[PDB]
């Protein structure tokens, strides 16, 4: 009986899905955190059987999806939630999708978990190069793709068993320049990779919990296609 929250999935073409498939090989219960703007699209697609083939784990099991929850890594607690998204067509019919709200929901419904996956990133200005990126744009890259990992950790540690484990995904652009990977996404990954260490000391010393990040090579997912050079 092991549970893994995977934060950051909008379809089955990304890394979050591959991670779900392989965890299933080990019978782990999977809970998805989905960015609200694409949560209803996702539920519909799922309900309409678009993911059935993609759910089959070779070994004649279906992916065991415990639950699928709206989740927005821009918002730590209920009172970070700004008015315009409170009235946003996509958000206002969903509730409890801030990082703290979903920690609580999950804990209330299923108890403690022992596996956490950060697998999301965003940067409004990824199409611009670093030099031409604005403060607002840069900081959104960092907030959504880097701070989001710290915040996840802080809220979830409390609902996780000790010896539990945490990953996130990164890209080599943090260490070696890849032109096109703009908007401060490279900066964000640099920070993410350094925060993984610092988080590892704190989580390690205080909770005996582990944290690492995987630097993946390229896959044609939604966000990857959204880069565009």
């Amino acid at each position: 009986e092991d549970i893994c929250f995977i934060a950051g999935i909008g379809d089955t073409n990304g890394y979050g899905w591959g991670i779900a498939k392989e965890l299933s090989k080990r019978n782990v219960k999977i809970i998805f955190g989905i960015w609200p703007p694409v949560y209803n699209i996702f539920m519909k697609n799922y309900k309409n059987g678009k993911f059935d083939n993609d759910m089959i784990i070779d070994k004649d099991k279906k992916m065991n999806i415990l639950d699928m929850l709206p989740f927005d890594a821009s918002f730590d607690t209920a009172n970070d939630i700004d008015e315009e998204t409170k009235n946003n067509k996509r958000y206002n019919m969903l509730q409890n999708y801030t990082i703290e709200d979903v920690a609580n929901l999950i804990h209330q419904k299923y108890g403690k978990i022992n596996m956490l996956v950060h697998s999301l990133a965003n940067a409004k200005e990824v199409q611009k190069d670093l030099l031409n990126t604005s403060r607002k744009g840069y900081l959104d890259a960092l907030s959504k793709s880097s701070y989001s990992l710290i915040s996840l950790c802080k809220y979830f540690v409390n609902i996780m068993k000790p010896q539990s484990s945490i990953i996130s995904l990164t890209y080599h652009a943090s260490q070696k320049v890849v032109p096109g990977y703009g908007g401060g996404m490279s900066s964000a990954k640099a920070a993410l990779e350094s925060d993984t260490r610092v988080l590892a000391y704190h989580l390690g010393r205080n909770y005996n919990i582990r944290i690492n990040t995987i630097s993946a090579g390229p896959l044609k997912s939604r966000a990857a296609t959204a880069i565009n050079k």
Binding site: G18, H172, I211, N212, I214, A216, P218, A224
Partner: protein, 60 residues
């Protein structure tokens, strides 16, 4: 053909390992990292990229 198609094409031409990189390739690594099998690893950046990250210069 955009940026990701360049990166995938370069990777598949130049990475030590020739095979197509699957999301499940990353998945089996995350699986392991999330398990007790890796109880002694933490604070690491682990590269799952068919080795591309080790190259300096191409051959073509």
């Amino acid at each position: 053909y955009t940026f990701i198609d360049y990166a995938i094409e370069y990777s598949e031409k130049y990475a030590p390992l020739r095979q197509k990189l699957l999301s499940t390739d990353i998945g089996s690594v995350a699986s392991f990292l999330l398990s007790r099998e890796s109880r002694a690893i933490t604070g690491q950046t682990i590269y799952v990229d068919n080795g591309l990250n080790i190259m300096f210069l191409p051959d073509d």
